[PDB]
Design a protein around this nucleic acid. Structure first.
Lengths: 157, 85
RNA sequence: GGGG
DNA sequence: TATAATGGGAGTCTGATGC
DNA sequence: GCATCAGAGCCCTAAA
């Protein structure tokens, strides 16, 4: 199993009377607490590319094929869209109910925050590992040790 | 009874050892080029250290009498190689 | 297998 | 020199002396 | 005690 390192910029919008202000979020840390359920809505029109992690999700809007937005859904936020769905500006992507927290496998390095009306929009610099499994057959030998650091192109088996 | 003291190989282990034997021969071939020695002489020197000090004798065809002095001298030329060699 |  | 093959078969009575 | 060993008559014939 190779856990691949991904470092990406993803956005989120929350009420203000519900988000806890921090400069970074460690895995598992509570991001916000909502008094009542809040509907996170699309800020762009596009087709949805949905990427679901172990816990938490990623949502990526693209028009034509150019990605116009990358949103981050923490734990406590249930996607209301399915992969490859057309959305219009303003329709709810995900419901956020109660306490929402960082997933266990994903972090938040730098956190930038803008304030608009009664909501905050987080530009999150997120780092996480996405697992992929490879099967090794009897005539194959693994040439790489447990915990090795590999770049693109390195031989594993 | 003595043969029954070595367990039979699994398909993986059989392939692993076989793999290592082939690779080692290729290594001795390369080690000959780098060093300017004789592939058989190198092979017997490599083999001498693996089996241990127990078995040391002149080998028919090797240019040098293969006594502890020569296996030390030649082993020291092999260990004088750069990390990649 | 026999002879003394 | 290349499917795979991995553990064997078989047949009196004396006295002296060292474990 | 019990096992392991090395002893157990001579010369001759023919057959293999």
């Amino acid at each position: 199993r190779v856990e691949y390192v991904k470092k990406e910029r993803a956005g989120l919008r929350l009420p203000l009377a519900a988000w806890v202000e921090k400069e970074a979020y460690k895995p598992g840390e509570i991001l916000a607490e909502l008094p009542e359920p809040y509907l996170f809505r699309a800020e762009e029109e596009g087709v949805v590319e949905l990427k679901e992690l172990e816990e938490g999700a990623f949502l990526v809007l693209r028009r034509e094929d150019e990605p116009v937005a990358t949103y981050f859904l923490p734990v406590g936020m249930t996607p209301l869209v399915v992969h490859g769905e057309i959305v219009e500006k303003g329709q709810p992507l995900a419901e956020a109910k109660g306490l929402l927290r960082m997933p266990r496998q994903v972090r938040a390095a730098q956190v930038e925050a803008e304030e608009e009306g009664e909501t905050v929009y987080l530009t999150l610099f997120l780092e996480w590992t996405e697992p992929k499994d490879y099967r090794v057959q009897p005539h194959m030998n693994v040439v790489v040790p447990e915990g090795a650091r590999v770049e693109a192109g390195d031989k594993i088996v | 009874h003595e043969i029954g003291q070595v367990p039979l190989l699994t398909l993986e282990e059989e392939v692993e050892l076989a793999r290592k034997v082939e690779e080692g021969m290729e290594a001795i071939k390369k080690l000959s080029e780098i060093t300017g020695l004789d592939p058989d002489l190198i092979r017997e020197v490599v083999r001498a250290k693996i089996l241990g000090s127990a078995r040391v004798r002149h080998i028919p065809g090797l240019k040098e009498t293969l006594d502890p002095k020569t296996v030390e001298e030649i082993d020291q030329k092999l260990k004088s190689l750069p990390k990649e060699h």
